[PDB]
């Protein structure tokens, strides 16, 4: 679960799962200012933008997905198997 | 998945250097050498 | 029927995409030309002095004409002498340039051809003012304009045409009709289908 | 010279082919949508008809009151040394002549209300290469009228030696200005002229000073238009895809109707307007006389080889001297070598 | 028999043409020793050799060129820039985007 005493909205294992897939090589998050400068005009991303090959961003961000996972884990811990059928029913974790 | 998408986009970018049977792989040295009578049979090869 | 008179060596310049003294300052043809160029040598019946523009401030647009016999302070009109007893590259040559267009308009100039009878509801190959094609002809109830000859489909396929003999509308359909399936057992068993 | 907006005006037939039930996209010269035309008045309490600019085409819409606008005079310099292509009615016929004209400073007319009719369009003509007279009209109402009644729109296009005229004529009840709406035109004239046209005027009828008239002049520009066609073969809708994002979206989606959502659009926004030319400054004329016209050319089995460098390539000096029996180029076009630069010539 | 050639070298034989002024940061169509194109010119800072006229990309697209006058280096960029999306409701509902 996320730590409320931290600036990040993701947990420790969720932070370790990030910084393991290198997304910088694909150029998913690139500005148009550095492409128009001309100093690094021989990049492999600015040619894709110059030839009309753009990459659209995903709808859901990472913070929303982290909130979804945290909600699912908290519902599993506090309620158990019964929050997927109807309303959430509290039960101690030992009895679950 | 990331490597495959990046490789596909890089291949699509790099596939612009094939002349496809025309006299050049660029549209600027075809339009600045041949007149409009016989330059239309070279641009269509590039488009197709 | 654009007509003029040039030297014999300049006939190669009357063409789409050429340069010289004819295709630059005298008479330029458009790039998308659809016509015929005819030229022949008459060095005996064309004797005199004929002029041509040697130099100009700019080139010529297609099918453009200028009769300025003197531009600024110079004539810009050189002359060559046409006669016999002269080298064949320097002899007169009549040139006639024609220009055609095939629109959806009634025809004015046609070729010699004899018209036959009209056959309907049969697979025939037709000919309507040079439009050669195959199909089944039948009478049509569609309404045309007062000038148009053939109406097109959504796939640029001519399906209706007007016969110039009797002014009426005909419909054109393919000879083959739809899909026809064959049901058979194995060949080694029988041959009935 | 006040400027009035032209809302969805000036749509004509750029192609002579017949099309029905099609959303075909053209790329030709059109009047841009919501462009600002100039307003020229003809009030008495003036008479102005300056030499306008004829570029790739002209949109001419005149709100006449009683036949004040008669016709037009085309040409290039309006001098003794260039041919004009006037289209003027004599109040009974229409004359289309392409001669060498001798026009005055103000080509006015006169009306029969003042018991004086004398066409003062031009002084004399000579060396005329085209002339035709047709009487497909009735005599105009020379007496005047107290308000504007009808508006006439005209478009002239010169291309490949062919002069095409498109016209429309609609009745309104106007007091000042130009209405808003979509107007289509139709071709009536496809004459062969053969002259080049860069400036044109308009002839107006004076009474001894006219009462009231107004005309508007626009210039066509290169643009992309999407047109709609009905079952009759006429235009019922037309959108200029260079003014609004919705127009670009309609062009990209290939439809006049769109649903609710977000779509990616193509680029019809920018267009080049000025040209840049950069060449090295070399002024030496090439030795085209000591190479071509030598004293003795060598025999074929011992042909020589000469190098050419630091030159300018001007074939024009051969135009009034020699005629080549054959001249054919491989690799480059024989018409694009005037503006080319080479690195080594033998 | 004349035999020309075109390379990435300084020119020696050229046709008659008059040079004009240089316009930057605009969508223009240029002409550099018979290399006719269309793009946006920008004062560049890349380094060439002592004889190179125009550089090339991975897709054989000319992006940097040296003008024959003043011997500077100019960068060429496309006139259209990026992807533009239009968000709209239905046409029958409204016409605001
Ligand atoms: C129509 O032809 C005339 C006559 O050649 C052109 O008038 C001159 O054209 C030259 C071409 O270099 C210009 O430098 C001059 O400024 C023009 N005007 C005068 C008064 O000499 C005219 O430009 C041509 N029109 C078009 C649209 O090409
Ligand atoms: C090449 O130059 C020669 C002279 O070396 C030219 O021949 C003569 O040119 C003069 C010029 O004043 C004329 O008056 C003569 O009639 C010419 N004589 C002959 C026999 O031609 C010649 O015209 C030039 N051009 C070519 C293509 O040979
Ligand atoms: C052919 O054209 C050339 C080029 O214009 C003419 O040569 C010019 O002649 C005049 C008059 O003698 C001189 O003032 C110029 O200096 C010449 N120009 C050049 C570039 O040499 C020539 O007279 C024309 N006619 C003939 C018969 O050759
Ligand atoms: C000639 O053409 C006219 C007009 O289309 C038509 O009525 C007539 O049948 C044709 N044939 C003969 C033999 O007159
Ligand atoms: C309106 O006229 C002005 C000049 O006053 C001009 O710059 C502009 O392009 C015209 N059109 C629009 C849509 O503003
Ligand atoms: C124009 O040409 C005519 C030809 O008849 C001549 O009479 C007239 O004097 C000329 N006008 C000039 C040069 O101003
Ligand atoms: C009609 O034009 C002719 C010249 O073709 C002229 O002589 C005549 O006067 C004109 N008619 C009228 C009524 O002005
Ligand atoms: C037409 O031009 C020619 C050539 O200059 C001249 O001889 C002739 O007199 C002109 N025609 C008229 C009617 O002036
Ligand atoms: C076509 O135009 C005619 C008039 O020529 C009119 O009666 C008819 O309604 C129009 N048809 C359509 C489908 O627009
Ligand atoms: C949009 O849709 C309506 C309903 O289908 C259709 O009739 C109409 O022609 C369209 N609107 C236009 C082309 O402006
Ligand atoms: C001529 O070329 C030189 C050398 O490239 C350049 O410096 C100069 O600006 C050019 N123009 C003039 C007018 O000297």
d(CA D342, CA E35): 11
Report the alpha-carbon distance of residue B12 to residue E95 in Å, rounded: 37
Contact D332 B34 (CB under 8 A): yes
Distance CA C177, CA C136 (A): 11
Instruction: Looking at the complex, report in whole angstroms how far the Cα of residue B2 sits from the nearest Cα belonging to chain A.
Output: 7
Which one, of D157, D163, D339, D28, lies nearest residue C65 by Cα? D163
Distance CA D86, CA D201 (A): 9
Residues A34 and D163: their CA atoms lie apart, in Å, by 52
Q: Is C112 on the interface with B (CB under 8 A)?
A: no
CA dihedral for E87, E89, E90, E94, sign (positive or negative): negative
C-alpha E9/C-alpha E51 separation (Å) is 6
Element (H, E) at B44: helix B40-47
- Ligand nearest, relative to CA of residue C77: 3
What secondary structure, in 3-state letters, does chain D show? CCEEEECCCCECCCCCCCCCCCCCEEEEEECCCCEEEEEEECCCCCCCCCCCCCCCCEEEEEECCCCCEEEEECCCCCCCCCCECCEEECCCCEEEEEEECCECCCCCECCHHHCCCCCCCECCCEEEEEEEEECCCCCCCCCCCCCCCEEEEEEEEEECCEEEEEEEEEECCCCCCCCCCCCECEEEEEEECCCCCCCCEEEEECCCCCCCCEEEEEECEEEEEEEEECCCCCEEEEEECCCCHHHHHHHHHCCCCCCCEEEECCCCCCCCCCEEEECCCCCCCCCHHHHCCCCCCCCHHHCCCCCECCEECCHHHHCCCCCCCCCCCCCCCCCCCCCCEECCEC
C135 beta partners: C124
Which element (helix H / strand E) includes B31?
Answer: helix B28-31
This PDB structure is determined at a resolution in Å of 3.5
Q: In chain E, which ranges are continuous DSSP H helix?
A: none
3-state secondary structure A62-86: HHHHHHHHHHHHHHHHHCCCCCCCC
User: Measuring CA to CA, which residue among D27, C63, D323, C19 is closest to residue B37?
Assistant: C19
The strand pairing partners of C96, in sequence order, are: C3, C38
Please check whether residue C149 is in contact with residue C110, taking contact to mean a CB–CB distance below 8 angstroms.
no
Q: Number of C-alpha atoms within 13 angstroms, CB side, residue C76?
A: 17
Does residue D3 have its Cβ closer than 6 Å to ligand 5? yes
Instruction: Looking at the complex, report in whole angstroms how far the Cα of residue C66 sits from the nearest Cα belonging to chain D.
Output: 7
Is any ligand 8 atom within 6 A of the Cβ of residue D284?
no
For a ligand 8 pocket test, name from D80, D102, D127 the mutation site with the most ligand atoms within 8 angstroms of its C-beta: D127
Coil, helix or strand at residue C108: coil
In sequence order, the β-bridge partners of residue C80 are: C50
Rg of chain C taking only CA atoms, in angstroms: 28
CA torsion, points E60, E65, E68, E69, in degrees to nearest 10? 170
CA distance C159 to C171: 6
Contact C31 B38 (CB under 8 A): no
Of E63, E75, E82, the CB nearest to A32: E82
Element (H, E) at C18: none
Are A25 and A33 in contact by the 8 Å Cβ rule? The answer is: no
User: Based on the number of CB atoms within 10 Å of its own CB, is D267 exposed (0-12), middle (13-18) or buried (19 or more)?
Assistant: middle
| Residues 6 or more apart whose Cβ sits within 8 Å of residue C24 | C56, C59, C60, D319
- Alpha carbon distance A88, A82 (integer Å): 6
Helix, strand, coil percentages, rounded to 5, for chain A: 35, 0, 65
**Paired residues of D73 in beta bridges:** D201
As a whole number of angstroms, the distance between CA D85 and CA D81 comes to: 14
Give the residue among C98, C89, C101 at the shortest CA–CA distance from C12. Answer: C89
Q: How far is the CA of D339 from the centre of ligand 1 (A)?
A: 20
CB D99 within 8 A of CB D123: no
Q: If you measure from the C-alpha of residue C106 to the centroid of ligand 4, how many angstroms do you get, rounded to a whole number?
A: 15
- Contacts of residue E66 in chain D, CB cutoff 8 Å? none
Task: Please name the method used to determine this structure.
Answer: cryo-EM
D192, D161 Cβ separation under 8 angstroms: yes
Per DSSP (E only), the strands in E1-97 are: 13-14, 27-32, 39-43, 54-56, 62-66, 73-77, 85-88
- Residue C164 gets the label, from left (phi > 0), alpha (psi -120 to 50) or beta, of alpha
Nearest-5° Cα angle at D100, D94 to D104: 80
Query: What are the distances in angstroms from CA D8 to CA A2, D14, D37?
Result: 60, 17, 12
CA D164 – CA C134 distance, rounded (Å): 37
Residues in chain B: 48
Instruction: Strand D3-6: give its sheet, edge to edge.
Output: D3-6, D35-41, D214-219, D58-63, D150-159, D162-171, D186-192
Cβ atoms of C26 and C53 within 8 Å: the answer is yes
For ligand 11, pick from E14, E69, E71 the residue to mutate: most ligand atoms within 8 Å of CB.
E69
C117 CA to centre of ligand 4 in angstroms: 13
Are the C-beta atoms of D251 and D227 separated by less than 8 Å? Answer: no
Per the listing, tokens 């609710």 go with D260
* Nearest-angstrom CA–CA distance, D200 and D49: 10
Backbone angles phi, psi at E11, to 5 degrees: -80, 160
Is any atom of ligand 3 closer than 6 Å to the C-beta of D320? yes
Return the residue of E nearest to D284 by Cα: E13
| The CA-based dihedral angle spanning residues D293, D294, D295, D299, taken in that order and rounded to the nearest 10 degrees | -110
Q: Which of D341, D345, D346 to substitute to test the interface with E, most E CBs within 10 Å?
A: D341
**Residue nearest (by alpha carbon) to ligand 5 atom 6:** D36
Inter-residue contact C151 to C143 (CB < 8 Å):
no
What CA–CA distance (Å, rounded) separates D310 from D308?
7
Task: List the 36-65 stretch of D: residues with Cβ below 8 A of C.
Answer: none
Q: Is D321 on the interface with C (CB under 8 A)?
A: no
């Amino acid at each position: 679960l996320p730590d409320p005493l931290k600036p990040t909205k993701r947990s420790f294992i969720e932070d370790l799962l990030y910084n393991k897939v290198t997304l910088a090589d694909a150029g998913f998050m690139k500005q148009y200012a550095d492409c128009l400068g001309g100093i690094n005009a021989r990049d492999l991303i600015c040619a894709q933008k110059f030839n009309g090959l753009t990459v659209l961003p995903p709808l859901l961000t990472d913070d929303m997905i982290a909130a979804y996972t945290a909600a699912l884990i908290s519902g599993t811990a506090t309620a158990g198997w019964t929050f997927g059928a109807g309303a959430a029913l509290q039960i101690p974790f030992a009895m679950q | 998945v990331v490597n495959q998408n990046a490789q596909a986009l890089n291949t699509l970018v790099k596939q612009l250097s094939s002349n496809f049977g025309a006299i050049s792989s660029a549209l600027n040295d075809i339009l600045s050498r041949l007149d409009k009578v016989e330059a239309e049979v070279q641009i269509d090869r590039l488009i197709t | 029927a654009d007509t003029f008179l040039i030297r014999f060596s300049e006939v190669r310049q009357v063409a789409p995409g050429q340069t010289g003294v004819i295709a630059d300052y005298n008479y330029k043809l458009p790039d998308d030309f659809t016509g015929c160029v005819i030229a022949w040598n008459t060095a005996k019946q064309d004797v005199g002095s004929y002029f041509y523009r040697s130099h100009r401030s700019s080139k010529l647009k297609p099918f453009e004409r200028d009769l300025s016999s003197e531009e600024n302070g110079v004539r810009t009109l050189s002359t060559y002498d046409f006669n016999q007893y002269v080298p064949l590259e320097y002899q007169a040559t009549r040139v006639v340039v024609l220009s055609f267009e095939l629109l959806n308009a009634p025809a004015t100039v046609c070729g010699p051809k004899l018209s036959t009878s009209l056959v309907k509801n049969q697979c025939v190959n037709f000919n309507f003012n040079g439009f050669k094609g195959t199909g089944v002809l039948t009478d049509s109830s569609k309404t045309f304009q007062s000038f148009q000859q053939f109406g097109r489909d959504a796939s640029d396929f001519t399906d209706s045409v007007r016969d110039p003999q009797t002014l009426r509308i005909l419909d054109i359909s393919p000879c083959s009709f739809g899909g026809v399936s064959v049901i058979t057992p194995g060949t080694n068993t029988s041959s009935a289908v | 010279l006040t400027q009035v907006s032209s809302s969805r005006r000036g749509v004509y037939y750029n192609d002579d082919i017949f099309r029905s039930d099609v959303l075909h996209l053209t790329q030709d010269y059109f009047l841009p949508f919501h462009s600002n035309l100039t307003q020229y008045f003809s009030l008495n309490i003036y008479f102005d008809n300056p030499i306008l600019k004829f570029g790739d085409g002209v949109y001419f819409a005149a709100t006449e009151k009683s036949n004040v606008i008669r016709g037009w005079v085309f040409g290039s310099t309006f001098d003794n040394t260039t041919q004009s292509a006037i289209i003027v009615n004599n109040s009974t016929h229409i004359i289309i002549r392409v001669c060498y004209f001798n026009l005055c400073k103000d080509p006015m007319y006169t009306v029969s209300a003042g018991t004086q009719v004398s066409s003062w369009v031009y002084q004399s003509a000579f060396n005329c290469t085209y002339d035709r007279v047709e009487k497909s009209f009735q005599l105009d109402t020379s007496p005047k009228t107290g308000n504007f009644t009808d508006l006439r729109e005209f478009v002239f296009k010169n291309r490949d030696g062919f002069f095409t005229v498109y016209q429309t004529y609609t009745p309104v009840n106007l007091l000042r200005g130009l209405p808003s709406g979509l107007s289509v035109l139709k071709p009536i004239l496809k004459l062969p002229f053969g002259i080049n046209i860069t400036s044109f005027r308009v002839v107006m009828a004076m009474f001894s000073v006219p009462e009231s008239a107004a005309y508007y002049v626009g210039n066509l520009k290169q643009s992309t238009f999407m047109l709609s066609f009905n079952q009759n073969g006429t235009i019922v809708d037309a959108v200029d895809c260079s003014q609004d994002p919705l127009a670009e979206l309609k062009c990209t989606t290939k439809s006049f109707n769109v649903s609710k959502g977000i779509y990616q659009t193509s680029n019809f926004r920018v267009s080049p307007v000025t040209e840049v030319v950069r060449f090295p400054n070399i002024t030496n004329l090439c030795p085209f006389d000591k190479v071509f016209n030598a004293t003795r050319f060598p025999s074929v089995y011992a042909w020589e080889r000469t190098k050419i460098s630091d030159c300018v390539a001007d074939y024009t000096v051969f135009y009034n001297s020699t005629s080549f029996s054959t001249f054919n180029c491989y690799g480059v076009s024989p018409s694009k070598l005037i503006d080319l630069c080479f690195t080594s010539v033998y």
